[PDB]
Subunit: 465 residues, 4 copies
């Protein structure tokens, strides 16, 4: 394990505290054994998400202070437009309040666009892996969300450079089975969140885009963690060994027609999202027509002016290789601590989180009893650290059959907010999980009490078995 | 006209400037003669809206700096929950990113809830006046938005205390015509924005709510300007002469079952919204399940923690009567200057804006050519002040006939952000509009070039009829 | 009277409240009938000073957030150095924590420098008018503070363009009487605070400086209100009718060798000061050696880095002519409201405050009895407004005689902070003072219960008669 | 070496960068081989001082935003007064712009007060150790600054619990030698900055006060690092094992009549100072009379209202034991990395810095050549770390025998990963220790040379 030094120093701090063991026992109980329902006061180190919990820079705060709050035509809207043209070469932007607002703007518009000439009667979206909000917006619009990530993502312990890659073979099979007229769009998720924050390679992105253009399919880059994906392409693809991060990013976006971004991830924000469209002005115009009732006027999209200002500055800071080397180096430090102590993880670690393979850590719990959640619950009761489950619990149920979607991966996700926690905080997280060495086989799964029909993991209430 | 002094002093400023006439003329053509498409840099004083442009206090900024950005369980969510219980006596909250996010959470839930028990077969919503994003969500979900504001709202020059009131006769007639089963909800808009920011009386709120419960109809308080409405109740209803503003608000919300709020108006914020539900936990649970895919997790709802913290403090500051007296007195001062000069306005002025009656100011322009928009564009080329149209352009086409919804009133809305402009800014606005007294005749209407199907006035480009 | 619109809009507000007459009377007695000893909570509109009470711009706050707090070599120290070269053409700067800190750094250095040559056996300083802390530092260093303002300043109701001017005949008289070897420095105070914020003409500054060089005498510009002085030069001097404000300022500082500045005035700050020296490197070095024990290291001078950053920005905003036009016009609006009702004021109004002539308003109270302080107290009891005395109270006793210095003016100063109050606040002040027309003849002065030996008006406790 | 986790998380960051080795030698050249003349843009990790470079909390920045900027009677002045009464039990406050502003207010007043009845004809001040600005103000007013730290502070490698103590024997001897009428005040400096940030025990503070009160001598507590001292007392005095940090502090200030404070240290500020007086109203009145010409009006003292607001909150946060344990543990972690690798340091480490003895690292450079400055320059050229010299360059040649480079650590600014960068730089200098040459004056000022002198390597 190698500690990589921060390429910054601290300017402002926020207190944290360890709640007592009896606080955590009561809190988890009151929260229905779902840490999503805990108050933050009951949490020590929060590893629930890397979304919106990032520490901004003094430059981002100063940009907020001078942000233009004008309802129409904010100065910051035009800076954000130029920045998106600078980084992605995309000519149209619509701000959104966060990533699932961008998906609510774009995905219904793509469906209606595809349904011209009476096509897309049995419509589907195709992705390496639809994350939860993305798949929910696909299915809420009456489509199937099809995930075709490479099967090397399924062998946790075996190294591979690109575990977020599309399976090109399955992509061709799905185009053959469904037909190009049913494929509303392809979604390239960079990095692949559900596979473990694992990068998609540039040739993979290129190859998927070639096939899509052959068949007239629209391609959307789910871009929440694009800077982490660009760093991995520079690190693992020899063809980009001497490229700047921005140069890799520019090339990534030659292989999509539009993007949906949660700016709460790699742009280092606490709120914000973005739709950018390359050159298709009709899809842009239709999305603007949906933005107005759902999000806001097309020059702020449900954001305050200051948050567009912070996003402009965040989009620059998130591409800095010195910062990305440290950020992804910190994730790698935590993974190497756990791996050295015999804890199975998705290897190599991805950009934003260590994914602990609980299918190997707790074999006595079947996947539909949520094994990673039993581990998460025990880790919290022992340490005050709050983690999150990326497995059968999050995967949910098939819209058609109403049964559990089969999960090939049962991950506990230790999600690391950017520039928030030190490597000493990582050591606490590592030692806490390692201290559970003798209790893993003792753990038992969980059973529902209240299950939402959609995105159930957020508010479900569980009971032990 | 009477000038009322600020109950505050200035702690931070932001420069503004006056574009040259050369820039304004050019900027308007580049904007398609739709001021909504002007860059803010081309605007001197911005009267487009009172939404999200407000100046916050130092205490509001301090609340932001210590805001808790946690994804789940932010301390500011629990503060917001207690604050809603304090102000409205409502036990459930869901934050939203702004008012139309709150509408998108709640209104589809209310429809499906009634549909699930075999009702709402031909569904309608009824309001004193649905505002545009509110009506847009009604229509997007397959329902009809019915507006029944008192006819006194159309008698602009004649003073009345409660020009936002429901027409009670018309409420009962619609309930009989459509049936209670088909009425998804009644929406009480306070103040009534479309009628000129005009207040709804307490006794009108109470009668509407009592009729609603007799028929099992859910009532939603559209609450963006609830503090301005409450100030008017204290000012004009003798029963509330000696009540506090909070006591007036507490009584107002006895006459609804839920609220949707744009916290960008009276809570004095730059972003933010809220759903609050009095005590219907099933509606609450259904609203939360829609919040998650559309807005965000149920304890931040598409807001930053710092914005929930700012809302908690702003909800307090927006009820302060010395602030409300000053704010509404500034709007009144602007209207008095215009009304002194013969310009017809909705009288008395409402809480957030002066509404100029352009059907009385420029009779030569027909309603479907948007006479208020012609006056707005001339005021911009003359002064750099950007105003907004509240008439046919905003009312739009009927989603069933595809033709112009008949506009009983053509208003140019001079909308005043809270604590942003001084009374000397008000004098500049009034002097410029009075300065167009000789050119109101020679003003002609406008036609469409690109018309959106929903909420057309925003991105539409207009062609001068000449 | 003419109301001039703010060339800004409001971005942040701070509550104020009117204390009840009962609280006012209790607080005034507890403060020893000296409003300097009132807590701010007992004050509605504060007109005690225009020092450190200004409202900053969003850009000033954005500069604070990114300020460099380094102990040595702050980025903002160098930016401030560059700003002084641009504005004043001066080559050396020493930041100070405020104006009297600048005077403490520089005045002892100028005296020892004059003595090292063998001179200064009976040392004096000469100014159009030394303000209080300036004269206190002159006297604390063993020198006499001689004031020779134009006689026009004593003719309060009669208009004159340049009531802050040096009396040229008296300058030569004092140079002949004391000898050039005894004059440590000439202090050009711009605007002349004690004469009523009244401007010094460019031709007067030039003639003073040329007389000073003739005799080898160092010239210091007391520059707390140099931008207001510059606006008056453009407005009233035909030579500069079409010059920019910055061009006026650059010409002003051709007529001095160094400057001491409270940045809490015209650079729109809440704290801060500055020494700038034109080119005399020896004085700069000696002043640096005194900066270290009294203020701090020479690259921050007792300021946080954020306050240097705000000063750079404020130096620029303080010179914008649209702002000065409004600021001075608001002072002029309040003065005109008072003058139209028959209240005698120093006319024309100066840059920062309206000076009410209380020798004429309350002729029954002798000067030694402080008639202006009687009007101030009455105004406060009536309205919550706190004003300050610029007469015999502030002038204090003479170090040699020990008795009251002869006061040629007895003013109540209504001091206006920058960008803080609106013209409706000005109307409130005007109506309050105008409403006291009947009570003016009935007022009675005060006596000393506790008199500090130096700068007695800040902390003295008085008792009516 | 044990790493102690931060009891906080990061809310706002500020970029740092490593300048190239060519920039370092060119900038150190322009700086005249004096690190104080480097711009910050030339410095990677700044270890020059723990004064004014601290990271504030979100609560401190919120307090600034609502700060009352009124000239007279700021809301935050009264808050600060109450906070001094709570923490110290002292009844009178005067804000100052920083520590040496507070000394400029109080020390000339104490001298005039002692002279009131034909006394103090040969006046002196006595301290466990006067810091530089403290000693400079004493001498600028015509007094001698006598330093009488315990002898165990001079044995750098040998542990002792209280290396900042007064030598009680010397205190009684100096009282007898100078007479209690010439002792204007005793200055108890906590922690003892010049001894290495080393604490003063409660019993030492107690006995010193008892002696002074018997002789009618005024006792001033120099309080810049009072919380760090309070932590060491609770950690090393068994009587206080179970006391809170605030209870320790309350007890400390029973043994003084006044305090001067740089709030730029333990109160976690970027600017700010404080005078507080226990109950002597006459000294308070005279101190206010000097505040007005020198600092500002007596309710802000040369501070913005926002900075007084931040001070009130910082005084609370600087007492938090979880934070102090981490803060003093991080300095100790750097010290242990160095001590475990054969680098001589003042042992144990103090509250705010690590002192490295360079006279033993470069046994080729004599005292008349500034060995610690050559190590500092060598450390800056290989890491970008700017440390300060406390040896033959702190000219106030006289004597020295102590050639220490100080590694001063700002509060809540640098991680233990930054500490490792620093330690590995100073340990990685083994290969170039022997080949390091001395430094000569290329340009020397007559006074305060280490602030502005220019040097050049000796060939
Ligand atoms: C009563 C009520 C409102 O007034 C209301 C918003 N009003 C606005 C803002 C904006 C919305 N459409 C417009 N058309 C023309 C000019 C401006 C606007 C206003 O400027 O009037 C909302 C929606 O909340 P939000 O804006 O999503 O947060 C719900 N209900
Ligand atoms: C011309 C000039 C000044 O006006 C000046 C400061 N003036 C002030 C502030 C204050 C000082 N004494 C007062 N007596 C009565 C009322 C207020 C005051 C003002 O309100 O007029 C200074 C000193 O600067 P600082 O305060 O250290 O930053 C130097 N020169
Ligand atoms: C690839 C990709 N696309 C779109 C989005 C949606 O963006 P948004 O609306 O939140 O801005 C995300 C968001 N991910 C975040 C937040 C989150 C959403 N659901 C979750 N379930 C469990 C744990 C966390 C989460 C994260 O994984 O922590 C994303 O990762
Ligand atoms: C015990 C004690 N008393 C008073 C003071 C004065 O407070 P101030 O005016 O700075 O606020 C201090 C301050 N010391 C600081 C800063 C500093 C001043 N001179 C220096 N020379 C070399 C290196 C650093 C410094 C420190 O040691 O780094 C103090 O330590
Ligand atoms: K957040
Ligand atoms: K806004």
């Amino acid at each position: 394990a190698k500690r990589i030094v921060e390429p910054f120093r601290i300017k402002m701090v926020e207190k944290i505290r360890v709640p007592s063991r009896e606080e955590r026992e009561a809190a988890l109980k009151e929260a229905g054994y779902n840490p999503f329902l805990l108050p933050s006061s009951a949490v020590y180190i929060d590893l629930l998400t890397d979304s919106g919990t990032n520490a901004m820079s003094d430059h981002q705060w100063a940009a907020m202070i001078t942000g233009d709050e004008a309802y129409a035509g904010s100065r910051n809207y035009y800076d954000l437009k130029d920045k998106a043209k600078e980084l992605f070469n995309y000519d149209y932007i619509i701000p959104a309040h966060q990533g699932r607002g961008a998906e609510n703007i774009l995905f219904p518009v793509l469906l209606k666009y595809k349904q011209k000439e009476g096509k897309a009667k049995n419509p589907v979206f195709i992705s390496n892996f639809h994350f939860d909000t993305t798949a929910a917006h696909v299915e809420l619009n009456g489509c199937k969300a099809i995930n075709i990530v490479t099967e090397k993502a399924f062998d946790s312990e075996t190294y591979d450079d690109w575990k977020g890659d599309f399976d090109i073979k399955k992509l061709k099979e799905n185009i053959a089975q469904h037909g190009a007229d049913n494929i509303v769009a392809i979604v390239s998720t960079v990095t692949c969140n559900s596979a473990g924050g694992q990068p998609v390679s540039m040739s993979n992105l290129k190859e998927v885009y070639e096939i899509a253009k052959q068949h007239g399919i629209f391609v959307v880059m789910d871009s929440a963690r694009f800077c982490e994906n660009a760093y991995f392409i520079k690190a693992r693809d020899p063809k980009y060994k001497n490229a700047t991060i921005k140069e890799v990013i520019f090339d990534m976006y030659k292989y999509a027609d539009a993007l949906t971004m949660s700016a709460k991830k790699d742009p280092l924000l606490n709120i914000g999202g973005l739709v950018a469209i390359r050159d298709n002005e009709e899809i842009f115009t239709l999305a603007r027509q949906r933005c107005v009732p759902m999000e806001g006027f097309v020059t702020y999209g449900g954001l305050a002016g200051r948050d567009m200002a912070a996003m402009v500055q965040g989009l620059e800071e998130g591409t800095e290789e010195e910062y990305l080397h440290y950020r992804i180096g910190q994730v790698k430090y935590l993974g190497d601590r756990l791996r050295e102590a015999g804890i199975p993880i998705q290897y190599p670690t991805g950009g934003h989180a260590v994914f602990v393979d609980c299918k190997k850590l707790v074999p006595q719990i079947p996947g539909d009893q949520f094994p990673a959640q039993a581990v998460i619950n025990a880790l919290y009761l022992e340490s005050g650290v709050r983690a999150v489950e990326i497995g059968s619990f999050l995967l949910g149920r098939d819209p058609a059959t109403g049964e559990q979607k089969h999960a090939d991966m049962e991950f506990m996700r230790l999600t690391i907010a950017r520039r928030v926690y030190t490597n000493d905080h990582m050591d606490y997280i590592a030692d806490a999980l390692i201290g559970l060495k003798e209790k893993f086989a003792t753990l038992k799964g969980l059973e529902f009490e209240y299950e939402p029909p959609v995105l159930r993991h957020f508010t479900a209430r569980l009971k032990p078995i």
